[PDB]
Amino acid sequence: KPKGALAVILVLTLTILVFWLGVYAVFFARG
Amino acid sequence: DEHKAHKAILAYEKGWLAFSLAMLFVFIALIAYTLATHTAGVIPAGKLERVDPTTVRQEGPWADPAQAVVQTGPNQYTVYVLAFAFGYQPNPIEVPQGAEIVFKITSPDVIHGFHVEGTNINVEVLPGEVSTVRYTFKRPGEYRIICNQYCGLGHQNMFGTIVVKE
Amino acid sequence: YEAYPEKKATLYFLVLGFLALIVGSLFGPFQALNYGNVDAYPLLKRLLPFVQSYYQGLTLHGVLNAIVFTQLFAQAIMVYLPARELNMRPNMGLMWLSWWMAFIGLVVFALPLLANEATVLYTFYPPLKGHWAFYLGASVFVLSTWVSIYIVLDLWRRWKAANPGKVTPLVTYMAVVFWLMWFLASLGLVLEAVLFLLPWSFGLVEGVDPLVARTLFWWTGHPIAYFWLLPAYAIIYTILPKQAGGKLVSDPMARLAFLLFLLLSTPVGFHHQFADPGIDPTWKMIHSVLTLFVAVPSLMTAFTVAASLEFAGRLRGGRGLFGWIRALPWDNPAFVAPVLGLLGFIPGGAGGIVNASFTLDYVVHNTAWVPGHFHLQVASLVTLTAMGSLYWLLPNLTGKPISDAQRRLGLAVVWLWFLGMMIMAVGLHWAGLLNVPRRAYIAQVPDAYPHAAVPMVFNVLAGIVLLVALLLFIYGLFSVLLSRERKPELAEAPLPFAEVISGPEDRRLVLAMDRIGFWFAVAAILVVLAYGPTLVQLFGHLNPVPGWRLW
Ligand code: HAS
Ligand code: HEM
Ligand SMILES: CCCCCCCC/C=C\CCCCCCCC(=O)OC[C@H](O)CO
Ligand code: CUA
Ligand SMILES: [O-][O-]
Ligand SMILES: [Cu+2]
């Protein structure tokens, strides 16, 4: 199995998730 | 080896493709949500409302900034903002807290930004058109308006004020 | 050169391209310091006396860096590479035509830009009215790509004439779907220039409708980003795996990424118009959903590429979860520059995904966040990929060798650029989150954004770091370009195209994907569907308004 690839996409997902959830929270604070 | 790795890579890429697809869909679901709540008020009403930039200061609801605040509901106020080079009228905009504020904003010269600091109100202002957004201020006090769209050399100093009374 | 005249043409596209980049980038560190709350413009105005405002410099920067350099690069890469794969000569008359169109258009547009006659920024939103020489000169520059489009479709059809019942080769397929996409993409701006911008700037009409301009603009406005991106992808996909010491793990998956870009790159422009009036929310939602879709091919790309790098790293001795990373050719700048660019693309695409989410755009629209998003994208990944190409492409095109020393300086420029870009990215996102506007001479209102004190520091450091990188890159480019030594065994040596790993492909999908005409039509229908109704309404109620010059 492509362990390295999976690591990279793990990081990619976490980044997207922190980013998206982050800005969503901020949107609601300002709502 | 090379034959094996190809099967494994592709096997997991299909996994990944499905997972990211879900995540994107879940976002879509979460975005669809916000359109159902009051926070969606800041989204501009998509309707076209043409005005004449050249005469907007001589005649109409933008002509007397002192009267740009108008009670249109039991708990609702329309405000006729002019974003121009380089400032906003009225200054300040005064609205009461808890009331739904319908901002009708336009420009007599170039395109400006209307971004109310601390809030989700962030709308482009186009000459010839009235931008319409809706907000209810939940905390009293002094919010700042910022012009986030380049409008010339006065851009960096173009600021406005909304005062929210208890 | 007599045998491969396409080398000299491609060379001219690259050099003029980097020239644009260098002059464009001279304004970079100064803008970085500005978002760091530091005013070093008096210094710049002594150094370059014709610069009248921060905003004239911002125009030069965007036009030169984001429009000029990137296009020239796209034209260089997505013409030469398909041509070298197919071992066929491009239509040379056409190739010089397109170069001259780009050069002449650039020079003509440069005239009013340098003269402070078109300080409108790279979006030139009406009613900000620029000099006719800017709109014309821009038009002739952009059109030069239609000539590129022809050339590649030509090469393509000719090959297919000689090779019926054969599938289109990987690079050529990429380049075809690329150009065809760009043609549809480009129709927005063409329409805007022809129906509005040109007539208006010449005096033919009194006003322009700002909303219809913005809408037609962003038609081309988004896909132009993928137009910048794909040439770097084509290198990352079909070349980088070799430089890394491995192979492309999938040919069909590369084609799929690219196909999806043809289909989903144009019908998404409203994501720039989230805070525009007079556009129905239901269309803003549709576009947002379609924008979320277009992020799929890059998500896909992320894996395919990462897999390819793992394969390379394992082949070179790497063992474990992280061991394949350290096993890679980190001594080779041609490998380092793109890989670094992909790393920053992580947060870059992540910020993009936020931008697309309709209501979430209100949090960040028009703040320093956006600049933070796109610098990771174009100013890092695209730029670095072009930078790293010097170390394989320039020798291939000129015969001039890359000395050991020059390779070491190459690593340095690349790393410093990458790091400065990261640093700046942190400073801008954070500043955008603090409501700090984009496109603003903020060091001239030094008491306006005290909350942004921290991210300002990152911005400053980023400014000096990137000043150093740019300086080193200037020295370094001229060291190789104006080098005495020349070796024609290098010019005749093959392009480092990677091989494709041994996997029975699914010949079915490849064949379907090869039905290009079909896919071109579909892509066109999707644009008619996503833009058609809205433009119909806008043209039915045009409200043109006087121009203004406020600089
Ligand atoms: C090259 C150029 C650029 C690309 C690419 C691009 C991609 C995105 N954009 Fe963007 N864009 C927006 C959304 C996105 C989305 C959905 C994507 C997507 O395509 C992103 C997909 C990417 C990913 C999901 C990441 C995958 C990651 C990969 C492929 C790397 C993996 C790493 C590896 C393999 C390394 C492994 C290595 C090791 C060895 C460890 C929106 C709105 O929805 C706006 C308007 C915002 C506003 O309010 O004004 C915007 C703003 C901009 C602007 C400013 C416009 C202006 O001037 O007014 C420009 C210049 C631009 C450029 C670019 N942007 N964009
Ligand atoms: C020396 C490195 C560079 C630095 C320090 C730098 C810095 C900056 C800064 C701080 C801004 C935002 C200014 C503002 O919003 O007022 C900016 C904007 C921009 N940058 Fe760069 N940058 C560099 C190179 C590049 C490159 C290589 C490109 C892409 C090829 C690029 C594309 C752009 C564009 C598209 C704009 C937006 C202009 C506009 O809003 O009209 N940057 N840069
Ligand atoms: C590698 C270089 C990339 C640079 C990385 C860019 C930095 C931005 C990072 C994450 C965004 C997360 C959004 C920030 C959210 C912070 C506020 C928060 O957590 O909000 C809670 C509260 O409800 C509301 O105030
Ligand atoms: Cu008004 Cu910027
Ligand atoms: O524009 O992404
Ligand atoms: Cu876009």
C355 and C370 Cβ atoms separated by less than 8 Å: yes
Q: Is the minimum CB–CB distance between C192 and chain A shorter than 8 Å? A: no
**Domain enclosing residue B33, as ranges:** 1-44
Cis-peptide into B61, omega within 30 deg: no
Chain A interface test: which of B120, B121, B162 (most A C-beta within 10 Å): B120
Report which DSSP code applies to B79.
E
Cα-Cα-Cα-Cα torsion C298, C299, C304, C310, nearest 10 degrees, comes to: 120
The Å distance, Cα C413 to ligand 4 centre, comes to: 37
CA C98 remoteness from chain centre = 19
Residue nearest to atom 6 of ligand 2 (CA): C28
Are residue B162 and residue B80 in the same domain, yes or no? Answer: yes
- Residue C271 beta carbon below 6 angstroms from any ligand 5 atom: no
- Which helix or strand (DSSP H or E) is residue B10 part of? helix B2-36
Kindly give the pairing relationship between strand B122-125 and strand B131-136. unpaired
B17 and B99: one domain? no
CA C330/CA C310 separation, integer angstroms: 14
Cβ C293–B117 below 8 Å, yes or no?
no
Residues B27 and B102 in one domain: no
Is residue A5 in contact with ligand 3, taking CB distance under 6 Å? Answer: no
Q: Do residues B141 and B76 share a domain?
A: yes
Dist CA C389 CA C478 (whole Å): 15
Residues B81 and B139 placed together within one structural domain of the fold: yes
Neighbours of B, requiring at least 3 CB pairs below 8 Å, are A, C
Do B82 and B140 fall into the same domain? Answer: yes
What was the structure determination method? X-ray
Residues B18 and B84 in one domain: no
Ranges assigned E (strand) in chain B: 69-71, 76-84, 87-89, 93-96, 100-106, 112-116, 122-125, 131-136, 141-146, 159-165
Tell me if C272 is assigned to a ligand binding site.
yes
The CATH number of the domain where B39 resides is what?
Answer: 1.20.1070.10
Compute the count of residue pairs across chains B and C with CB atoms less than 8 Å apart: 203
Q: Indicate whether B85 and B138 sit together in one domain.
A: yes
CA atoms within 13 A on the CB side of A25: 7
Partners of B152 on chain C (C-beta within 8 Å) are 55, 128, 548, 550-551
User: In angstroms, what is the span from residue C271 Cα to ligand 6's centroid?
Assistant: 6
Sheet holding B93-96, edge to edge: B93-96, B159-165, B141-146, B112-116, B122-125
Q: Which residue has the tokens 């910020």?
A: C351
Q: Find the CATH number of the domain harbouring B83.
A: 2.60.40.420
The alpha carbon torsion through B61, B64, B67, B72 (nearest 10 deg) reads 0
**Cβ contact B12–A27 (<8 Å):** no
Per CATH, domain C1-551 is 1.20.210.10:
yes
Residues B14, B50 within the same domain = no
Let me know whether B130 and B89 are in one domain: yes
CB distance B156 to C55 below 8 Å:
no
Domain count, chain A: 1
CA distance C313 to chain A (A): 10
Residue C466's closest CA among C19, C4, C22, C47?
Answer: C22
CB B100 within 8 A of CB B77: yes
Domain ranges of chain C: 1-551
The Cα diameter of chain A in Å comes to 45
Structural domain of residue A25, as residue ranges? Answer: 1-31
